[PDB]
Design a protein around this ligand. Sequence first.
Ligand SMILES: CN(C)C(=O)CCN(C(=O)[C@@H]1CCCN1C(=O)[C@@H](NC(=O)c1cc2cc(C(F)(F)P(=O)(O)O)ccc2s1)C(C)(C)C)c1ccc(-c2nccs2)cc1
Length: 558
Amino acid sequence: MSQKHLQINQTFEELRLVTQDTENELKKLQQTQEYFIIQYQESLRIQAQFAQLAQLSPQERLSRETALQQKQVSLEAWLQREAQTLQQYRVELAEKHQKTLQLLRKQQTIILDDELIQWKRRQQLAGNGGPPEGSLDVLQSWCEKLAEIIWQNRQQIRRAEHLCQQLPIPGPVEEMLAEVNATITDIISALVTSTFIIEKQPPQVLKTQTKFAATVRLLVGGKLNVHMNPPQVKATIISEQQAKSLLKNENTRNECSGEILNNCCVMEYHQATGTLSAHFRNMSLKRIKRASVTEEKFTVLFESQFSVGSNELVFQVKTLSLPVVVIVHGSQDHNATATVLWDNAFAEPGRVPFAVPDKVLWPQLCEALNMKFKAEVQSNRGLTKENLVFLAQKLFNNSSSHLEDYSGLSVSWSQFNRENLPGWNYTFWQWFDGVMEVLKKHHKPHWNDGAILGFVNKQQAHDLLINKPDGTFLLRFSDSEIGGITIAWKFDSPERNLWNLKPFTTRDFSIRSLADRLGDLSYLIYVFPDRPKDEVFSKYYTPVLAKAVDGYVKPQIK
Ligand SMILES: CN(C)C(=O)CCN(C(=O)[C@@H]1CCCN1C(=O)[C@@H](NC(=O)c1cc2cc(C(F)(F)P(=O)(O)O)ccc2s1)C(C)(C)C)c1ccc(-c2nccs2)cc1
């Protein structure tokens, strides 16, 4: 276990102990108050006995009167001392409650403002291919203890308040309790609202009329008996503007930007795991309301209303999903992805709904592109420092081959996916995404195997192959054709020594695969640097299969 995590567990055990201590004190204080009340009635009976001396022999009366006086004077003195003891125990209990609430405040800030935020950030980067955020198991186990400890303390101070109503003692206790109560309502509000979270986000590139899912959960749901009357959670699609004003409490009526089919779900309690979660499995976007379409951000607002405890402590919880870009056609998916990638990667913590920086530094963009690239190609072979130099030369229209020279250069959103690259009809994102699309669709094994060098220009291709045996070739990414793969090969000749074949695209690869095509060209012998062609591609050569129409009753490879 981590050291930061062990300290959290140490504090939970410390908080449990001090809450037991105030429970014991409150039981002692209830006994003192009850005994004091019996003794107060004993003082009224001394008075009643004095009135019963009216019918007594004044010789015997003298004895029974001095005795009643000695009893009254001592019981009166005891009662007065006991009254200050009751006030002192009530102050020492309020001080103890104030002390544990401050330790609980520090503990809750760690759980909610750091550990939960880290998990949410991990879930946010996972949308770009980052490593999975992991189970909410730990955050739930911690939030359960926050709920259990704040509740135990609230019911202790409700019991203390009953005692004060039963026997009021004016003084500093009344304002110490008024303060402890304010601290409790803040802790409970922050805990309830902050633990209503999306476990499984909806798709960030969302086509209308397409089934989609999301999972919301209340981390403290089982501990505060919210599972008793499981609340209905409703999902609505809202705009970036509607989200901004929603958080500033300017929601006019019930603002929304479209309709979600099957947008209602009742939370389900799972006794074994203690989890209270709404699983929306069949949501669908029926319509969307507009104001680029691929730059327009929406969010799925999940809201619910429930109360904590037998009585009415009602909470209205709201949680916004990570921004979503709504497409209708499917061809819009590529540009929508850039808007999502920029948001997921560069959102500053604590931002107002969907504010992103205009510019980032080249190494920040590199981290985002490499994370996306490996998720798309499904490989651990990502963008090397050389590949980054190639993309930096392309993006900045620079000649440097030193990655360090690009360190302090900034890429704006328009430089990434608005303005086209010099002398081209496409943006840097459209070029990079075109490479990912061609690799993902047909060449995942080839990319993983090292068979596609790709991120080299014509001059780099020339200088790598110049001193290689004839038939040495590399597969490169085409500049002129988005999603294109061109063969560069060396073969000594009078005109040129290096040659670039016409690039292939997914349409060509659907008719005949890259491996089948390379296998047909007998003049391609070595895959750069010196790997025999069949060694790298033979695994993927289509074995010619005979057909049923040609008279073959059993499958046959002809
Ligand atoms: C059939 N067979 C046995 C063969 O050997 C035929 C091979 N073949 C050829 O000869 C073809 C036939 C016509 C001339 N051809 C050429 O390739 C000639 N070259 C070129 O035409 C070009 C090279 C490049 C490179 C690029 C780039 F590198 F990608 P970029 O980064 O600037 O974008 C861009 C444009 C061109 S045009 C040449 C001879 C080699 C000079 C072959 C190549 C590709 C295709 C395609 N089919 C489906 C799509 S592309 C079919 C024919």
